[PDB]
Structure formats: structure tokens, C-alpha cells
Design a protein around this ligand. Structure first.
Ligand SMILES: NC(=O)C1=CN([C@@H]2O[C@H](COP(=O)(O)OP(=O)(O)OC[C@H]3O[C@@H](n4cnc5c(N)ncnc54)[C@H](OP(=O)(O)O)[C@@H]3O)[C@@H](O)[C@H]2O)C=CC1
Ligand SMILES: NC(=O)C1=CN([C@@H]2O[C@H](COP(=O)(O)OP(=O)(O)OC[C@H]3O[C@@H](n4cnc5c(N)ncnc54)[C@H](OP(=O)(O)O)[C@@H]3O)[C@@H](O)[C@H]2O)C=CC1
Ligand SMILES: NC(=O)C1=CN([C@@H]2O[C@H](COP(=O)(O)OP(=O)(O)OC[C@H]3O[C@@H](n4cnc5c(N)ncnc54)[C@H](OP(=O)(O)O)[C@@H]3O)[C@@H](O)[C@H]2O)C=CC1
Ligand SMILES: NC(=O)C1=CN([C@@H]2O[C@H](COP(=O)(O)OP(=O)(O)OC[C@H]3O[C@@H](n4cnc5c(N)ncnc54)[C@H](OP(=O)(O)O)[C@@H]3O)[C@@H](O)[C@H]2O)C=CC1
Ligand code: PMR
Ligand code: PMR
Ligand code: PMR
Ligand code: PMR
Lengths: 316, 316, 316, 316
């Protein structure tokens, strides 16, 4: 079988670097690392010892739609088939009193996590359909805290998308609120809302394109990878205390290598061919279909998100 | 006359942002801002109020040759003529005890300042030749401290390229020294050596291509722009003390706007059509041809630099 | 002679209420009070005892261009000649840590004070030209603190329009700064910058239309009217202490009636027919031509302001 | 090509004797040595071994206009073409408390250095124009200390031409000051002012006659020739100490032969055909265009000098 091509976002840092390492040590994949920092992506690829032939770094800054369209035109210029697209990029700002916004004016957490991935996926889907590979998949990462069923979701600050009032406003923050619900700005709630938007995006993609094409859509929660850089902006005391807290008190700590092997299994396991599944892993390395929260599963809300995002990015 | 296209590097920060502002408020230029951070480049363009039509951000990480070739292929895919190329990018590490290296192994100051610009210029020169614009120019920035004639050049740490011993080694730093001369690593000497390499590059380009094509080659020293981010890695006390020191004691302080208008004058002045000139500006906004140091003007050394760099980047 | 029509902004509060009282007790003027609050404008008109026949309240919210165009269409629907236009509206936010923005996204102080008046004046100028009245004038209010020549201008926070960097950005506050210079947001500096913009607007109007039409353009500083509502948002201690401080220590206190009679004199005095004058009053009720600051008198900067404002409001 | 004729002033002493030696050992020039002492000029010509055929001593005392006109009438009586005119004469009085004046009353330093050369050049220019030689040049010597950009210019006594107050007075010293600025008499300042006047004279000649005729105008600084007789009037201790001081501490010492070969290169080099250049030489015998001081480059001041000198010498 032809070595398959995998476009993986945010490969510079832990999760994507591990996934690329796992999918390149096999020798059966060509990985394309789409990252904002080109130099940070070379040092990681060399450090992790991925073969030179297998990787091919390319630029992609999700916060800027122009960067996305440029990446797309270059990727179509390479005249290479596209098989699997992984959306794993994210920026988290726990302790911001004043928000930072992206190029088109959107709050930075929601543009990087959802809108950019939303545009990239829809643009590259046309390339995915015209691919002769046996299995085509589109992987979207998610977090357990997005769902409120679990204790992690029920922490004092939690996610909410009550009326998509902010998204309709355009998230500019002018004569409006950056938060989708419309409440006071909170660093965590925006990230959680973006994760929920990603889950709804997966559901809607399954509903609209699964029968038409045959492109598997999936989402997964790897675990609490406390060693990565997502908490870089957090205070040091947190960074230090959190990993032991997860290891011993909550027992949800997962090693980086385990998370990479899990995501790669999602990418390349024949068994996991059911679309529209919020995957999850057990303590014994067992893959199961976890259950989403009520709001996350709402059809109308997801439709409302789909149309609003489509208008905002200029797809209309 | 057709609005001319200007590819300007490092536009995100002071000098290139000012140059783009100056060349875009006229309305007679299309500027292409080639910068490592796409988001930092949008916020600057909006803040400086450049017209939307005039600017078109594109990615370019000089430390990675792959990024350069990608930028080149995309720029040729846009099917747009290229008229003027400006090389103004630089990274300065005053207070590093251990050096940081670029993707191909070269010390970070020499790859960004000289090697990347050297490859980009040679690749884009073919595009420059096939351009119907009346005036085609290639601007390379330089610093006065590179020359040792002046007091600024005679500070206790100063530039030296004695045998190009490090460049021949390949600057990997393995079984060798990163410094071109071969001495103990110094943060400033590397940057100054790169500036000297840029001056020699201009001279050699003038000798090899001025008669054949008709592409003007120029270098300029704007002044001590103490407000920019080049000194970001320096200690705070320096950042604070240096600007007044230049303003009052050495009287070499130049405003950012003045430096931008000067560089833009170099870009678009009909009078300044003499190639191979190390330009400079007077207190009264007067442009003169300053004189380089003995070593900077050495023909054999520049030839030796040209061949070594050509081999290192894979042009051979 | 026909009773002349005077459109006076912000008549609800002190300065415009006094001006309307002065121009209506004569019986020689029809005043049109253009104010954001219609009810606040009736209670003031009744309280000040202006004749019912003379006044005719109409709506105008400067922060919203739609309101301005609506007011203009209604005023042209009344089929009444327009003779004198007075721009005296202003909102001041001394103690704001987070800024409030107007409908089109502009910072609230600069849109109300300058942009709205700029659009209204240019739209109504066509009506002014086609008026058979002997004397046609356009009055723009200003403040002494806008000029830095005087001690009032040299208070610790002072005005600055260094590059019109914010105005070119569009003052949205997204990926930019609301302040025109680009500095950290200050409540007072915005208001002072708007006053400077108004002075430059008067100068440019004099240069562009005085010869063509014959419409006198004027600006004036009445004095420190400490009894008005401009300081409503300030703390109480200031409101209490400031009036005596001006009365006795700085001796710049002027009664409201004096300010109204002065502005009305500007409106209706035959002697004061010289255009482009920053008027001012002496202790003995003597009118003199005060001198503006260097920056306020800059031609290029005023041209730059004119073009930018014209583009922003959609006149282009 | 015809052996060209070179009129060289002050050939008796070092610089002109060396220039004549250089231009006569070639065998391609006829040199006319215009010197105040006829006997001192024969002993030098014999000592330096110039061919008898090549030299032809003639009298010229710059301090006396009558001598200049006599020299001119004799030179026109010889019925010989004139190609190149060199003005290198100078008298320096470092340690004079009471000044010595020339025949028409002018202070001796300014008449010999500038006024006499000014009259001779203008009179002989008519002869230069009617010459069929391929290259016609007019060489005026200058000194670096005239410019205040360099450390040599910033010695405690320095040059100044503030209002040309003395030149307008006529330099008689009666009811006036001999110094051009009007200050107390200083031996050095007069000589430096005369050098500045010579530079301005070159500039004005370039502006007024370069396009009309095609006569190249040039000025040059050879270096510190400490072996000549200019310091004859100085104390012995200076004469002794200065040459080593220049050789070792300031490293500006140039041998007499080098200065002569440099000036002769200016006279006869095809490359150096750009007019209005303040030439200079590098340590490696490299000719460059040095930059004059602000005052030296002032157009109005040079015009003012031109008209005043023209009136004083009776050209009017
Ligand atoms: N505890 C955890 O960490 C958990 C992890 N996850 C998931 O892990 C995923 C990966 O984040 P994680 O690896 O953990 O931590 P990281 O933030 O360190 O990895 C994030 C990656 O996103 C990349 N990135 C950020 N912004 C952009 C951009 N504008 N354009 C392109 N790439 C960008 C970053 O590039 P760069 O390297 O330069 O920063 C980095 O490679 C997240 O999507 C999150 O949902 C899920 C549950 C919990
Ligand atoms: N005192 C002075 O500042 C003097 C200035 N100069 C010249 O000024 C020039 C500009 O540096 P300056 O504006 O002063 O200070 P800056 O470093 O802030 O500007 C440097 C620019 O280079 C860009 N850059 C850095 N690395 C890369 C890369 N790998 N790829 C693409 N772009 C990159 C930076 O992008 P980013 O914005 O993300 O950092 C930035 O825009 C220098 O070349 C220097 O020789 C000359 C003499 C003295
Ligand atoms: N110390 C001082 O007071 C000095 C006064 N001045 C000038 O006095 C002028 C008047 O301000 P002042 O009377 O002193 O204090 P006020 O603010 O109380 O008067 C301001 C007027 O502007 C009106 N206004 C505010 N916003 C709008 C809007 N969006 N649309 C229409 N009208 C609006 C207000 O209506 P409403 O009544 O509902 O608030 C009010 O009538 C100012 O332009 C200022 O430059 C000059 C120097 C100093
Ligand atoms: N350190 C230096 O010496 C430097 C030299 N120069 C230039 O060198 C040039 C030559 O002076 P330099 O050779 O150095 O020293 P000298 O004074 O010994 O040479 C001067 C020449 O001028 C001649 N001369 C003086 N007065 C008259 C006159 N009234 N009529 C005709 N000729 C006259 C002298 O004749 P006589 O032989 O009888 O004295 C002598 O030949 C000067 O113009 C100076 O600007 C420039 C910079 C520094
Ligand atoms: C007991 C189960 C459990 C698990 C598996 C997680 C994972 C989890 N640890 Mg949450 N967390 C759990 C619970 C708790 N830890 C808690 C706290 C906590 C904080 C402060 C934070 C966090 C986070 C999470 C996250 C990581 C999501 C992230 O990286 O953004 C999951 C999966 C992370 C987040 O929510 O930020 C947006 C973060 O800042 N947890 C609390 C309160 C003490 C409880 C009891
Ligand atoms: C008197 C003239 C003069 C001028 C125009 C500059 C410009 C200059 N200021 Mg140097 N500098 C001058 C002299 C001096 N300042 C000096 C010091 C100094 C430092 C520490 C530094 C510097 C620098 C420069 C540079 C800027 C080059 C840079 O941005 O990298 C020039 C043009 C800059 C540099 O060399 O770093 C690589 C830097 O770190 N100068 C010293 C010792 C006190 C002297 C007397
Ligand atoms: C001595 C003359 C003088 C005059 C005529 C005014 C008028 C003036 N009193 Mg300023 N002011 C003067 C000076 C001073 N009082 C000062 C302070 C001051 C404050 C805090 C304020 C003010 C203001 C002014 C203003 C009114 C402008 C306004 O209403 O916005 C003028 C004309 C007003 C302003 O600047 O806000 C934007 C305001 O908030 N002045 C200071 C510092 C103690 C000095 C010495
Ligand atoms: C460091 C450079 C330098 C150069 C190239 C010259 C040439 C120079 N040495 Mg000045 N001089 C320099 C500097 C200095 N020597 C200095 C002094 C000095 C004196 C006293 C004199 C002089 C002179 C010069 C002159 C010769 C001009 C002349 O012959 O008239 C130049 C070119 C000469 C002059 O100025 O008289 C009018 C003379 O009398 N220099 C001083 C103070 C110690 C400094 C540091």
C-alpha cells in the first residue's frame, strides 16, 4: 500500500510531536507538520529523531485566514494526495484580565481552536474526497472538561454556549462581548467553548458528509497531559503542583508517549471505523465510545454554529 | 507607471514596518511583508494603518532553507513581477554564554543575517531580471559597527573574519568553533561578522551581475535606532540607558520615521542609481557614500565568502 | 432682515442652553436644538424660558452616523434655510480604565467631538451655500488645553497627535490602540486630541472653502465653565474643589451667562468676520485672536487628518 | 597626444616641487612654476633633477594683484595653451600677536590663500576654455582642519565664517577686524577660513561653469606633510615634536613623495573626472570622496563669498 500522507497541526509541541514520532518510526506514513514556528518545528523533528524523508514542515498560523489559504494553495501545488487530517492545535490563556484578539478580530482562543480548523478542514475536504487511499479520516481533538457530565467539567468555571450570542456578534469585542454566551471574559470558558464547538463540528460533518463521501470523522480525549506547553502562560506553582496531583490524587495522568500511540491508533486502526464517535481510552489501554453532554449533542445548536462560522470565515 | 512590488523582510518590527508605512502611504507600491510570525505581522500592519490593498503578508523563516524555498515557490505561484528586494532582518544575542543554532546547524546570528538572505537574493534574482520595471534594486542593510574605521567599530568587542576558518568548517560547532575566526563565542562578534558578510555580498553581486543585468545593489546605515526590538534579549538597564546616551552624549539617535523615510528614499530615489555604494545619511538628511573598512573591501576574502556560502546552502 | 436659523448642538446642557437663551431673548433667531435626549432638551428649554415659537428640538446622536444622516434628511425635509451651524457637543471620561466605543467602533471621545461634527458640517455645508442670508458662519468650539503653549496645556497628561497612527488604524481598538498616537489609553488625552482635530478641521475648511463660498469659519475658547456637566463622570471631590480653585487661585472662572453671550457675539457680531481665527476673550470682555500651538497649525498633519476622516466616515 | 601644460603655484617648496618632479619624470608634461622667489625656484628645480626642457619658471606674488595681472599678460604673450591650473600656495603665521597685511590692505593669510588664487583662476579660465586638450582641470588644495566634522577640525582654535562680516568690511583692519567673523585676531583661524573659502570657491565654480565649459573642478586633502616649510614661522619645539606625533600617535603622517604622486594622480587620472569633489586618500593609496562640513557646503554663504571677493579684486 502507498505510504499515506498525514497533515498534523501543532506538531512542534508534545502531542503532535509524539504522534509524528509514532507514525514515522513505523515507516508507513509521510507526515506534514503544519506549525506557526518553522524553527521550533525543525528542532523538535531532529530531537525526536524522525527520519528526514518522512517529515516535511510547512507553515500554518490558524489565527490568520490568509495563512490558511496560503498553506492550502501550497499544499495543492505540491501535487500530493491527502489522506488524514489531524486538528490538535490549541492556545490556552488561564490568567488574562484583558483578552488578546486574532487578525480578523475574533478572541484568540476561539479562532485558533475552532474557526481556523473549521476553514482548513472544509477547504481540504475536497482534496480528501479525491484520494484513492483505502481509509480517509479527519481527526479533531477535544477535552473532557468541555462535557459537564464529568467532575472535570463541573469545576467552578465551566463551559456554556447559551445563545451563541457572541458568535453572531462576530467576537470583535466592540459594542459586544468576546465570550459566546455574553458573560464577563474568562480565560478558561473560551477554551472550553471552543472544544465544544469542535465536537459539534464533528457531529455536523458526520451528518452532512459521512454518507456522501465516506470520510470517517472522529474526536478523542487522550487524558491530562500535564507535561506539555498548554499551561505555559499559567503561574509556575500550578505547573509544578498539577502533575503530581493528577498522578496520585485523581489518577488521570497519562504519559506523552501513551497519548501519541493512542491518537496514532485512532489514525490507523482498522477496527475504529465508526464515524461521529467521541473516543476515549481506559486505564488498560482500552478504547471506548464516551458519551457527550446534552448541550454538546444538540442538533439545532450545532446547525446554528455551522452557519454562523461559515458566514464569518467568508465561505458564503 | 505600474504600482511596483517590494518584498520587505522583517516588516513586523520597527525598521521594516516604518518602510512599509512610508511606501504604502504614497499609494505607488505593493508591499509583501515576509516575516516569521504571521499574527505579529497583521497586528503591526493594522496598527500602522497601511491600506488593505497594498500589503500581502507571506511567511519566511530565514533560519530554515526549506522555508525560503517554500516562500520562493509560492511567490512564483502568485504570478506577480518582482522589482525590489529588501534584506533587513536580524536577530541579536548580546548576553548568551551558550549559543543557539539554526536548523542546518549554523550559529543563529550568521544564518538569519547572511546565509538566508544570500540564498533568497540569489533565487529571486532570476525573477528580478525578468521584470519590465524601470528601476530594479536589491537593498541589503548594514551596520556602522561592522566597519572598524569609526569609534563605534572600535568598541572593546569588535568584528573579525581572519581566515573564514569557521565558515569553511560549516559552523556546526562540532569539533570546531561557531565563530568564523575560530575564537571564543561572543554574542556581538557574530552579528558584526554577519554584517560584514552582507557588505561583501553586495560588493560581489555588483562585480558579478551589475553589468550583465542592470540590477542596482546598495547597502546603507540608517543610524542607531534604539527603540526597536533588536535589544530585546539585552538586560533592561541597557535598554533604558542607551537611548538617552545616543540622543545627548553621542548625538547619533535617529527617529524611526526618519530611518524609514531614508530607506524608502534609497528604494525610490532616481538620483541614487550608483551600485555598490555603502550609503549613509547626514545630520541634515543628506545622503552620502560612506567608506568601508580595509577588510570589508578585500576582494579575495569576499570571493572566499561567496564560494563557501554557495557550497553550504546547496546551490552547487 | 429674515429671522436667521441657527442649528446648535448639545443645547440641553450649559453652554448651548445659554447660547440658545441669548439668541432667543433677542427675538431675531430661530434656534434648532440638536440633542441626544429629547426629554432633557424640553425641560431645559422650558426652564430657561425660551419662547415656544423660537425653538424646535430635533434628534442627533453624534456617535451614530445613521443618526446624523437621518437628522440631515429631516432637516432638508423641513424646507428651511440654514444659516449658522454651531458644534459644541462633547463627552469627557476622566477616570476610565477600560474605554467605551461608539457604534462604528471608534473610541467614544473622538467620534462625538470630531468625527460626527466633521460629517455633519460637510453634509450641511451644501445647505449653507444655498442660503440668501447676509452672514453665514460655522462655529466649532475648542479648548485651551488642546494648545500646549499655555500652562493649562502643560498639565502632566497633555495632548499629542504624533503620526495619526490610531486614526489610520480606524480606532476600532482591535490589533491596535484606540489612542491616535498609539500610547496607553488615557481619558483626557483623547478629548484633547479631538479638540486639536477640531482646530485643524477649522483651518482646513478655511483653506478649502473660504474663497469658494464665503462661509466664515471660526473657533473659540470661552473659559473654564466649571458648573457644566462635562465633569459629571469625574469624582465628587473634584467637582467641588475645582470651581473655587479657578475662581480664586487661577482666576479663569467665567460665568455661564458670559460664555453664552460671548459665543452669541461670535455668531452675530459684524466685526468678527475674519475666518480661520481661534478667538478668545479677555478679562474685560474683549475679543482677541489667540495663537495656536505649532502642531495645531501644521498643514500636512491637518491634510492627513482630513483625508483619513473623510475615508472613515464613508464620504469617499 | 600633445605634452600638456601645467601651471603649478608654489613649486619652490615641498608639495609643488614634488608634484613637478612627478609630472616631469614622466616626460608627458610642460610644467610652469609660478613662485614669489625666482632664485629659490631654480635651486629646487636643479636639486630635484627635473629636465631643463620641461620646466619654465615664471614670477607670481599672490599678495599683489598687479603681479597676478602681469603674470597673466606674460603667460598670454608666450602664446602657449593652458590645460591644468593648480592652486597650492599658502603662508601660515601660527604665533603672530600683530598681523601683517598684503599690498591692497587684506590680511596676509586670506589674500595669498584665497583672493589671489580666486583672481588668477578666473582670469586664466578664459585661456582654459580655448584649449584643445582632452582633459582640462582646475585643482585647488584644501585642508582637513577646515572641516569641523573631524577631530583635526575640533582642535581648541577652529574655523568660522559666521557673517562674512570682515570680508564685507574689506579686511583692511581699519575701524574693523581683519578676521572674517570679526573676532580677535588668531593666526590659525585666518588660514582655516581661507581654506574654507577655497572649498566654497570650488563648489561655486562647479555650479557656474561645469555645464557651460566642461572644466573639471576638484579639491583634495593630501595629509599632514610635517616636513614642509609651512611651519617655518612656528617655534622649533613644535617643528621637532610634530612629525613623530603624527607618525606614531595619530598615524596621519604621509611622505612628501606620496603626496606629490597623489596630487599628480588627481591631475592626470582618467577615472577622477567627477567635478566638485573634495578628494582624499586612504591608508592603502585609495582615492575616495570625503564629505565636507555643513557650513562649507552652504550655498548662500558661498554665493556671498563669491560676490564679495569679485567686488574686492576689481573684477566688477
Ligand atoms: N492536559 C492536556 O494537555 C490535554 C490535552 N488535550 C489536547 O491536546 C491538544 C494539543 O495541545 P497540547 O499538545 O496539549 O499543548 P500545546 O499547546 O504545547 O500543543 C499545542 C500546539 O498547537 C500549536 N499551535 C498553537 N497555535 C497555533 C497556530 N496559530 N497555528 C498553528 N499551530 C499552532 C503549537 O505550536 P507551538 O509549538 O509553536 O506552541 C503547539 O504545537 C489540544 O488541542 C488539547 O485539546 C486535551 C485534553 C487535555
Ligand atoms: N540600532 C539599530 O537598531 C540599528 C539597526 N540596523 C539594522 O536594522 C535592521 C532591522 O533590525 P531592527 O528593525 O533594527 O530590530 P528588529 O530585530 O526588531 O527588526 C528585526 C526584524 O527581523 C525579523 N526577523 C528576525 N528573524 C527572522 C527570521 N528568521 N525570518 C524572518 N524575519 C525575521 C523580525 O521579525 P520579528 O518582528 O518577529 O522579530 C523583525 O521584524 C537590522 O538588519 C540592522 O542591521 C543597523 C544599525 C543599527
Ligand atoms: N470647562 C469647560 O466646560 C469648558 C468648556 N469648553 C467647551 O464647552 C463645550 C460644551 O460642553 P459643556 O457645555 O461645557 O459640558 P456638557 O457636556 O454638559 O455639554 C455637552 C453637550 O453635548 C451634548 N452631547 C453629548 N453627546 C452628544 C451626542 N452624542 N449627540 C448630541 N449631543 C451630545 C450633551 O447633551 P446632554 O445634555 O444630554 O449631555 C450636552 O448638551 C465643549 O465642546 C467644550 O469644548 C471649552 C473649554 C472648557
Ligand atoms: N601639513 C601640511 O603641510 C598640509 C599641507 N596642505 C596644503 O599644502 C599646500 C602647500 O603648502 P606646503 O607645500 O605644505 O608648505 P609650503 O608653504 O612650504 O609651500 C607653500 C608654497 O607657497 C608658495 N608661496 C607662498 N606665498 C606665495 C606667494 N605670495 N606667491 C607665490 N607663491 C607663494 C611658497 O613659495 P616659497 O617656496 O618661496 O615659500 C611655497 O612654494 C598648502 O596649500 C596646504 O593647504 C594641506 C594640509 C596639511
Ligand atoms: C478527577 C478527575 C479529573 C480529571 C481527569 C481532570 C483532567 C483535566 N485537567 Mg481537572 N481533572 C479532574 C478533576 C479536578 N482537577 C481540578 C482542577 C483543574 C484545573 C485548575 C485545571 C484542570 C484542567 C484539566 C484538563 C486539561 C485541559 C487543558 O489542558 O486545557 C483536564 C483534561 C485544566 C483546564 O481545565 O483548563 C482549561 C486546568 O487549568 N483541572 C479539580 C479541582 C481541584 C478537580 C477535582
Ligand atoms: C559615538 C558614536 C557612536 C555611534 C553612532 C554608535 C552607534 C551604535 N550603537 Mg555604539 N555607537 C557609538 C559609540 C559608542 N557607544 C558605545 C557602546 C555601544 C554598545 C554597548 C552597543 C552599541 C551598539 C551600537 C550600534 C547598533 C548595532 C545593533 O543594533 O546591533 C550602532 C550603530 C550596539 C552593538 O554594537 O551591538 C551589536 C550595542 O550593544 N554601542 C561606546 C562605548 C561607551 C561608544 C563610545
Ligand atoms: C492657570 C490657568 C489655567 C486655566 C485657565 C485652566 C483651565 C482649564 N481647566 Mg486646568 N487650567 C489652568 C491651570 C491649572 N489647573 C490644573 C488642573 C486641571 C485639571 C485636573 C483639569 C483642568 C481642566 C481645565 C480645562 C477644561 C477642559 C474640560 O472641561 O475638558 C480648562 C479650560 C480639565 C481638563 O483638562 O480636562 C480634559 C481638568 O480635568 N485643569 C493645573 C494643575 C493644578 C493647573 C495649574
Ligand atoms: C588625529 C588626527 C589628526 C590629523 C590627521 C591631523 C592633521 C593636521 N595637523 Mg592636527 N591632526 C590631528 C589631530 C591632532 N593634532 C593636534 C594638534 C595640531 C596642531 C597644533 C596643528 C595641527 C595641524 C594639522 C594640519 C595641518 C594644516 C597646516 O599645515 O596648516 C592637519 C592636516 C596644524 C594646523 O592646524 O595649523 C593651521 C597645527 O599647527 N594639529 C591635536 C591636539 C593634540 C590633535 C589630537
Amino acid at each position: 500500500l502507498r505510504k499515506g500522507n498525514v497533515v498534523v497541526t501543532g506538531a512542534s509541541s508534545g502531542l503532535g510531536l509524539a504522534t509524528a514520532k509514532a507514525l514515522a518510526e513505523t515507516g508507513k506514513w509521510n507526515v506534514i507538520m503544519a506549525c506557526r514556528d518553522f524553527l521550533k518545528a525543525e528542532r523538535a523533528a531532529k530531537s525526536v529523531g524522525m527520519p528526514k524523508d518522512s517529515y516535511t514542515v510547512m507553515h500554518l498560523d490558524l489565527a490568520s485566514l490568509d495563512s490558511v489559504r496560503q498553506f492550502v494553495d501550497n499544499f495543492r501545488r505540491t501535487e500530493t494526495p491527502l489522506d488524514v487530517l489531524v486538528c490538535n492545535a490549541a492556545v490556552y490563556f488561564p490568567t488574562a484580565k484583558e483578552p488578546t484578539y486574532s487578525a480578523e478580530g475574533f478572541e484568540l482562543s476561539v479562532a485558533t481552536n475552532h474557526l481556523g480548523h473549521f476553514l482548513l478542514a472544509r477547504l481540504l475536504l475536497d482534496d480528501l474526497k479525491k484520494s484513492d487511499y483505502p481509509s480517509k479520516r479527519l481527526i479533531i481533538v477535544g477535552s473532557i472538561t468541555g462535557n459537564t457530565n464529568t467532575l472535570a467539567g463541573n469545576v467552578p468555571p465551566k463551559a456554556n454556549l447559551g445563545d451563541l450570542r457572541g458568535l453572531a456578534g462576530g467576537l470583535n469585542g466592540l459594542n459586544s462581548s468576546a465570550m459566546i454566551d455574553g458573560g464577563d471574559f474568562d480565560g478558561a470558558k473560551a477554551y472550553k467553548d471552543s472544544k465544544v464547538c469542535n465536537m459539534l463540528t464533528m457531529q455536523e460533518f458526520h451528518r452532512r458528509f459521512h454518507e456522501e463521501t465516506g470520510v470517517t470523522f472522529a474526536s478523542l480525549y487522550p487524558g491530562c497531559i500535564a507535561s506539555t506547553g498548554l499551561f505555559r502562560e499559567h503561574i509556575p506553582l500550578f505547573r509544578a503542583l498539577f502533575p503530581p496531583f493528577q498522578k496520585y490524587i485523581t489518577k488521570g495522568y497519562v504519559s506523552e508517549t501513551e497519548s501519541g500511540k493512542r491518537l496514532a491508533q485512532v489514525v490507523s486502526d482498522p477496527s475504529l471505523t465508526k464515524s461521529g464517535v467521541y473516543w476515549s481510552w481506559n486505564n488498560a489501554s482500552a478504547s471506548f465510545e464516551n458519551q457527550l453532554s446534552e448541550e454538546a449533542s444538540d442538533v439545532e445548536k450545532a446547525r446554528k454554529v455551522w452557519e454562523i462560522s461559515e458566514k464569518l470565515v467568508g465561505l458564503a
